Each structure stands twice: as structure tokens, then as C-alpha cells.
Design a protein around this ligand. Structure first.
Ligand code: 5GP
Ligand code: MG
Ligand code: ZN
Length: 326
């Protein structure tokens, strides 16, 4: 099922060295990997090593894992390899800024989860899959694609010489797969609404306790949401360019629905682009802003993401007022 990287791909990755100038910039939240496509795999290797240590993973296995994961992301407009690395970098930044709050096991697992969270995405949402009795919606009744993404992750790990977690004790092994499982499922936005309200409630009543595994799971879940949506925390021009990619997939889905005799929601209707600005305002107010607000409360060092998100919210309002530019 899973595609496999060539020997030239993983072998070449092992010899990669991150340019000195980027070492500085990669630590910042607003960092945009966009202008460095050839370096994305190497950037991930770098983040893993800085966060988890150069010997955490056997280099050969890690490189095969990375290049195969890349080969298993499809050439879709948004849920692609570029997105995977973007999300992993946000997680890297969050972990670097809250290092000792998370275990070595969790950091390894979360960085890997972020790189694999949208594995083998076809370009169709859970709505489509369920509303069209796709085999996946039957196998996975809820969080359909997310369960599939996790399934894909384990399949890659099982490929020969690809299991980077085998050196963990039998106990930590199962523990890390559970961390990855929950983390990937948490990227199902449907689950975000409940998770955020819960955390907010926990935080304000003073109940939140990081030594409480159920609370840890929720915090990690919000972190995944935060990283998944981080394109809204970049400089405006970057945020805007990514938005076009997001909508390219939305509109493509809408077109397929029309062909199947079912009118799509406005957001997925390429004939209703005029409604995009207002729709983004809604998404920021109902999802992005609350997410980063709650995350900042729990992990103060992540405040730059909230500030950036608010700045972009202001940009969308500026568009609606007819003051946009370029
Ligand atoms: N309307 C809207 N949806 C977004 C935006 N950013 C992310 N999303 C949605 O949030 C989802 C997060 O889940 P994932 O990216 O892991 O599939 C994306 O797939 C996409 O459907 C945005 O700026 N606007
Ligand atoms: Mg996803
Ligand atoms: Zn994603």
C-alpha cells in the first residue's frame, strides 16, 4: 500500500546540513518554510535532532521514514507535504519554548505525529466521505480521515527499516503510538470545539493539572489544533497565499459534489468567492482566535501565535472594508 522512498532519497537526506542563517529563524513561530522547498526534509531532521537529540533515532531509519512519508503525501493543493512540515515546525517551536513541560517520549511522538497527521489525504473532507458512503466512512464512522492518517502512519513504520521507534522499550513503544494516535485524531476539527471548552473550563476553575493524564491529553490536543491551523499565524502575505491553497481544495470538492448531484456549502462553491472574506472572519472568530487564546493561557510562551492570529483577523476585516492591497 504505502509507497517507499528510493535509496537515493534517504541517502541524500543523511548528508544534509542546515544553512547557518536558517538556524536562527527556524526557532521563531512566524518562520515560513515556503521559500526553502528543497530543504524541508532536512529541516525536519534538524528539528528532531535539536528537540530530541541526534541519537534519539537511528539516522538511517529516520531518513527512510521521512522520505517515505513525503512520498505518501499526495499532490493536492493544501493537504500536502508542505503542510505536513509547516505543522511540524509549529510544534517544534511550541516544544522548544515549553521544553521541560513535555517528556522526551511526547516530544518525539508529537513531532512525528505532526509530520504524519494528514498522511495520504485525497483532498476530500469527512463530510464528503460520509455523505457518499465511501469505504472509509464505513470503516471509520467518526474522524474518518484522521483514523486513516494514523493507520497510514503505522503502515509506514512497519515498512522494512522504517520503524524509528523499535528501540523503545515495549512499554514506551505502545505509549508513543497512543500519543501519536490521540494527537492525530485530535486534528479532527469536529473534536476541537469540545476540547477547547473543556480546557477553558478547567483553566478558569483552576482544575487544570498537567500531572493529570486526561488533562495532558487535552492540552496536547489543543497544541495539535494550534499547529494544524498555524498558517493563520504567519505574516499576512504568507497567510493569504496559503488561504488560496486551502480554498483550491474546497472548491475542487464542491465541483465533484455538483457532478454527483449535490449542491455544496457556500465555502466550497467556487461561484461564491465573494463570500470568502466574511467566511474567514467567521472561522477566525469561531476557531482560530479561541484556540490560540486558550493555548496562550495554558502555555504563555506561545503568545506570539495569538498576536499573529489577531493581526491576520484585522487583515481580513480590512479586506471586507475594501481596503485590501496587492
Ligand atoms: N475556512 C477555513 N478553514 C480552514 C482554514 N485553515 C484551516 N482550515 C480547515 O481546518 C482543517 C484542519 O484540519 P487538517 O488541516 O488537519 O485537515 C483544514 O483541513 C481546513 O479544512 C482557514 O483559514 N479557513
Ligand atoms: Mg487533517
Ligand atoms: Zn492538517
Amino acid at each position: 500500500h504505502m509507497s517507499i522512498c528510493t535509496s537515493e532519497e534517504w541517502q541524500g537526506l543523511m548528508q544534509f546540513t542546515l544553512p547557518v542563517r536558517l538556524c536562527k529563524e527556524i526557532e521563531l513561530f512566524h518562520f515560513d518554510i515556503g521559500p526553502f522547498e528543497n530543504m524541508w526534509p532536512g529541516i525536519f531532521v534538524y528539528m528532531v535532532h535539536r528537540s530530541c537529540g541526534t541519537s534519539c533515532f537511528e539516522l538511517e531509519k529516520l531518513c527512510r521514514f521521512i522520505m517515505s512519508v513525503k512520498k505518501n503525501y499526495r499532490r493536492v493543493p493544501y493537504h500536502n507535504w508542505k503542510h505536513a512540515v509547516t505543522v511540524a515546525h509549529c510544534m517544534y517551536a511550541i516544544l522548544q519554548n515549553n521544553h521541560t513541560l513535555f517528556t522526551d517520549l511526547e516530544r518525539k511522538g508529537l513531532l512525528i505525529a505532526c509530520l504524519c497527521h494528514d498522511l495520504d489525504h485525497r483532498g476530500f473532507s469527512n463530510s464528503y466521505l460520509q455523505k457518499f458512503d465511501h469505504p472509509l466512512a464505513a470503516l471509520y464512522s467518526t474522524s474518518t480521515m484522521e483514523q486513516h492518517h494514523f493507520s497510514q502512519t503505522v503502515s509506514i513504520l512497519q515498512l522494512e527499516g522504517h520503524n524509528i521507534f523499535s528501540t523503545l522499550s515495549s512499554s514506551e513503544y505502545e505509549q508513543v503510538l497512543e500519543i501519536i494516535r490521540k494527537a492525530i485524531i485530535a486534528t479532527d476539527l469536529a473534536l476541537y470545539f469540545g476540547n477547547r471548552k473543556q480546557l477553558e473550563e478547567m483553566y478558569q476553575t483552576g482544575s487544570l493539572n498537567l500531572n493529570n493524564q486526561s488533562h495532558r491529553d487535552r492540552v496536547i490536543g489543543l497544541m495539535m489544533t494550534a499547529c494544524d491551523l498555524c498558517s493563520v499565524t504567519k505574516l499576512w502575505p504568507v497567510t493569504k497565499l496559503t488561504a488560496n491553497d486551502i480554498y483550491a481544495e474546497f472548491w475542487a470538492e464542491g465541483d465533484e459534489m455538483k457532478k454527483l448531484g449535490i449542491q455544496p456549502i457556500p465555502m466550497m462553491d467556487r461561484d461564491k468567492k465573494d463570500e470568502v472574506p466574511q467566511g474567514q472572519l467567521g472561522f477566525y472568530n469561531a476557531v482560530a482566535i479561541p484556540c490560540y487564546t486558550t493555548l496562550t493561557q495554558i502555555l504563555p510562551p506561545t503568545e506570539p501565535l495569538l498576536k499573529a492570529c489577531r493581526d491576520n483577523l484585522s487583515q481580513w476585516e480590512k479586506v471586507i472594508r475594501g481596503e485590501e492591497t496587492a
